UniProtKB/Swiss-Prot annotation:
Transferrins are iron binding transport proteins which can bind two Fe(3+) ions in association with the binding of an anion, usually bicarbonate. Responsible for the transport of iron from sites of absorption and heme degradation to those of storage and utilization. There are two forms of hen transferrin, ovotransferrin, found in the ovoducts and, serum transferrin, secreted by the liver. Serum transferrin may also have a role in stimulating cell proliferation and is regulated by iron levels. Ovotransferrin has a bacteriostatic function and, is not controlled by iron levels. Monomer. Its main location: secreted. Residues 3-328 form the Transferrin-like domain. Induction: Up-regulated by dietary stress. Increased expression at day 14 in the magnum of the oviduct in the corticosterone-fed laying hens (at protein level). Different forms of hen transferrin are distinguished by their carbohydrate composition. Ovotransferrin and embryo serum transferrin but not adult serum transferrin, have bisecting N-acetylglucosamine. Transferrin secreted by embryo hepatocytes in primary culture is marked by the presence of (alpha1-6) fucosylation of the core N-acetylglucosamine. Serum transferrins also differ in the number of attached neuraminic acid residues. In both embryo forms, sialylation occurs on the Man (alpha 1-3)-linked antennae. It comes from Gallus gallus. It is found in: Secreted. One of its GO terms (biological process) is response to xenobiotic stimulus. The chain holds residues 24 to 351 of 705 of the full protein. Keywords: Allergen, Disulfide bond, Glycoprotein, Ion transport, Iron, Iron transport, Metal-binding, Repeat, Secreted, Signal, Transport. Disulfide bonds join C6-C41, C16-C32, C111-C193, C156-C170, C167-C178, C224-C238. This is Ovotransferrin. GO terms for molecular function: ferric iron binding; iron ion binding.
Length: 328
């Protein structure tokens, strides 16, 4: 019996084969299918051409719509003060000194993890809109990118389609610079994007600074929704939202057990406590954003199985869910 994972980048593939390689000796075994975009994975998965992929809540949302109707099989666990939780916080990071508040955000540059991802988009944009900041009336008259491209001087937003302003700060080969897996894509990419000065703001996770710049953590602060700017380590108070962990998405069939089995074991032999050269998660550390969050976030510490009961909606929450919807 084999599970076929869908990978979305070469390096992600490798890590994948890696684990398949040192796993081929079990009841359930791996195999890596590499697609172009997560969409194609979602699709293959539904077509029986694959069986799993771990997605950001923004994509989990997507993966749940019809025709797919994929379910969140397992969700990532993250360090909490209280040991652990299945959620993370969305924060907007900023360099220390550059005075400026949430309100003074117009005509700025900004870096985002990618189009429609929780932290780098859904939360921030919808927030900005829910605040009278961004002018958006609706789908049937104006796109969202457009309202976005109208608010910021320019941006980096991997996945962007409708506006070159949004692809303005993306560093890399122009062919692929705004690719969904571009060098400036992902939590860490959006950080570099900030690091490198290509944007005045980064929309990332509460772990973001530590994982790329624990050394120069002092060099950054957080933009709070109230007006303040707090210290990188104050995400709790200075946050824009608390979102659901990324989840592993799979067809609603009988296989969901083979997958959980596979994951349960693998995580057993290669967790944060593994003693192997091979790590399922991370580990976290200043590395090249390109090699980050492969398969799973570098910041995941465990996997917690999801109750069969939950679909995408129940998983995300009626609130977040409506919020995402209302944006498309
Ligand atoms: Fe995320």
């Amino acid at each position: 019996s084999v599970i076929r994972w869908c990978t979305i980048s070469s390096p992600e593939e490798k890590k994948c084969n890696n684990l398949r390689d040192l796993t081929q000796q079990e009841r359930i075994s791996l195999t890596c299918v590499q697609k172009a975009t997560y969409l194609d994975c979602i699709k293959a998965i539904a077509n029986n051409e694959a069986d799993a992929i771990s997605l950001d809540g923004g994509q989990a949302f997507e993966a749940g719509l019809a025709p797919y109707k994929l379910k969140p099989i397992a969700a990532e666990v993250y360090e909490h003060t209280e040991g652990s939780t299945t959620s993370y916080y969305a924060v907007a990071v900023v360099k220390k000194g550059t005075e400026f508040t949430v309100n003074d955000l117009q005509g700025k540059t900004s870096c985002h993890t990618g189009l429609g991802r929780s932290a780098g988009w859904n939360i921030p944009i919808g927030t900005l809109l829910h605040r009278g900041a961004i002018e958006w009336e609706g789908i049937e008259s104006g796109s969202v990118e457009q309202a976005v491209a109208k608010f910021f001087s320019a941006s980096c937003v991997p996945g962007a389609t409708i506006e070159q302003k949004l692809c303005r700060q993306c560093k890399g080969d122009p062919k692929t610079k705004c690719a969904r897996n571009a060098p400036y894509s992902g939590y860490s990419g959006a950080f570099h994007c900030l690091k490198d000065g290509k944007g005045d703001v980064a929309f990332v996770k509460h772990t973001t600074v530590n994982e790329n710049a624990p050394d120069q953590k002092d060099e950054y602060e957080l933009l709070c929704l109230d007006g303040s700017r707090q210290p990188v380590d104050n995400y709790k108070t200075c946050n824009w939202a608390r979102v659901a962990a990324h989840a592993v998405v799979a067809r609603d069939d009988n296989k969901v057990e083979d997958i959980w089995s596979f994951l349960s074991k693998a995580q057993s032999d290669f967790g944060v406590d593994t003693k192997s050269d091979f790590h399922l998660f991370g580990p976290p550390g200043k590395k090249d954003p390109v090699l980050k969050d492969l398969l799973f976030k570098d910041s995941a510490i465990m996997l917690k199985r999801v109750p069969s009961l939950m679909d995408s909606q129940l998983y995300l929450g009626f609130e977040y869910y409506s919020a995402i919807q209302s944006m498309r």
